[PDB]
């Protein structure tokens, strides 16, 4: 099972999330109390990368989903039968992959030859002209309820910083729930 152990490393890697609220209008919403993200199937999920010193050129950023419960942790997280076969390709993403990165022509997808676990990587780009972090837009392509897929089983997303050679520079994670009412579910779960 892939490690979900935090690692800040020599660059001080950490994650940041937008401070949206629980209005029924929010598309994506993160709960600090629950270290849990609530989002809508296929909408933008900004995830920010905070670092103390700028990583060397060739650094890459990777994302992977795993089941949260120990009894399911060995089952690779993938899309349900229907989603896997519907026509929603962007021409870059494998059809079975749950997580996608939007707005980046340099995204790369991976089907692990040995573990069979899916993941997405993009080059690390330091903060914009007047910015303190670098943002990556993710998309989750199945609902947590998807019968045959996640089938109402909680999952976690693990983000890792790595050198051009694949070596680990940092790791962080958060729980995710893909649902139609992100704000409502966050409020109720926090209640």
């Amino acid at each position: 099972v892939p490690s979900q152990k935090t690692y800040q490393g020599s660059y001080g890697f950490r994650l940041g999330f937008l401070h949206s609220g629980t209005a029924k209008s929010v598309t994506c919403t993160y709960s600090p109390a629950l270290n849990k993200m609530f989002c809508q199937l296929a909408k933008t999920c900004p995830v920010q990368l905070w670092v103390d010193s700028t990583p060397p050129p060739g650094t890459r950023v990777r994302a992977m989903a795993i089941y949260k419960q120990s009894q399911h942790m060995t089952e690779v997280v993938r899309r349900c039968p229907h989603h896997e076969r519907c026509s929603d390709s962007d021409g870059l993403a494998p059809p079975q992959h749950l997580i996608r990165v939007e707005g980046n022509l340099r995204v790369e997808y991976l089907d692990d030859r040995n573990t069979f676990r899916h993941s997405v990587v993009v080059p690390y780009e330091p903060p914009e002209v007047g910015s303190d972090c670098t943002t990556i837009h993710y998309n989750y392509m199945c609902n947590s309820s998807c019968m045959g897929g996640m089938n109402r089983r909680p999952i976690l997303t693990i983000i890792t910083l790595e050198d051009s050679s694949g070596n680990l520079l940092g790791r962080n994670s958060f729980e995710v729930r893909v649902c139609a009412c992100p704000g409502r579910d966050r409020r109720t779960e926090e209640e």
Binding site: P81, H82, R85, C86, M147, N151, R152, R153, A180
Partner: protein, 193 residues
């Protein structure tokens, strides 16, 4: 010979269909594209054959290449009578196509075509199921729970939905089967009335 059943159904040779169905009383019609005899009958519009085959016990929920079942085919034809018959006999109302991922109800009227109003019937069921018939419902398939709060189902079980709704899952009905209660995927259910 299966090809005989497929084409006589398509062509409407009811006498013939009736003759060979016994010469493979295990039709198990699938065809390389996933179309079966029941798909052909519904499509060509041969109610009597549709009736005969279903009555014979032909699987009402056979899905072809794109996930189209005979109900999807009946609705695309805006055929409420055939739709009422299939549902009556076990149509999986929530079966969806794999590409555009739509139900039979969504298939109604190619476009303006042969007056929809069929949609209402199907949309009615999708909305009244589990509550009407005094909340009784039937399992069109078996179900092995993933999570603890899920009712174990089996091919054809009668149960009463102890309500459902949005609060927790739209795709999952909360039912009582026998004396136990739990979550059931509405996708494998039907009124079976």
């Amino acid at each position: 010979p299966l090809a005989l059943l497929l084409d006589s159904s398509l062509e409407g040779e009811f006498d013939l269909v009736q003759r060979i169905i016994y010469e493979v009383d295990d039709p198990s019609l699938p065809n390389d594209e996933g179309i079966t005899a029941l798909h052909n009958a519904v499509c060509a519009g041969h109610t009597e054959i549709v009736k005969f085959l279903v009555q014979f016990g032909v699987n009402v929920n056979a899905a072809d290449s794109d996930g189209w079942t005979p109900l999807h085919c009946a609705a695309s034809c805006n055929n409420v009578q055939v739709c009422k018959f299939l549902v009556e006999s076990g149509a999986a109302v929530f079966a969806m196509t794999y590409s555009d991922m739509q139900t039979a109800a969504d298939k109604c009227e190619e476009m303006e075509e042969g007056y929809t109003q069929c949609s209402q019937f199907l949309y009615g069921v999708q909305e009244k199921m589990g509550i009407m018939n005094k909340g009784v419902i039937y399992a069109l398939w078996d179900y092995e729970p993933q999570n603890d709060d899920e009712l174990p189902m089996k091919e054809g079980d009668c149960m009463t939905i102890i309500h459902r709704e949005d609060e927790d899952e739209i795709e999952w009905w909360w039912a009582r089967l026998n004396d136990k209660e739990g979550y059931v995927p509405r996708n494998l259910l039907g009124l079976y009335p």
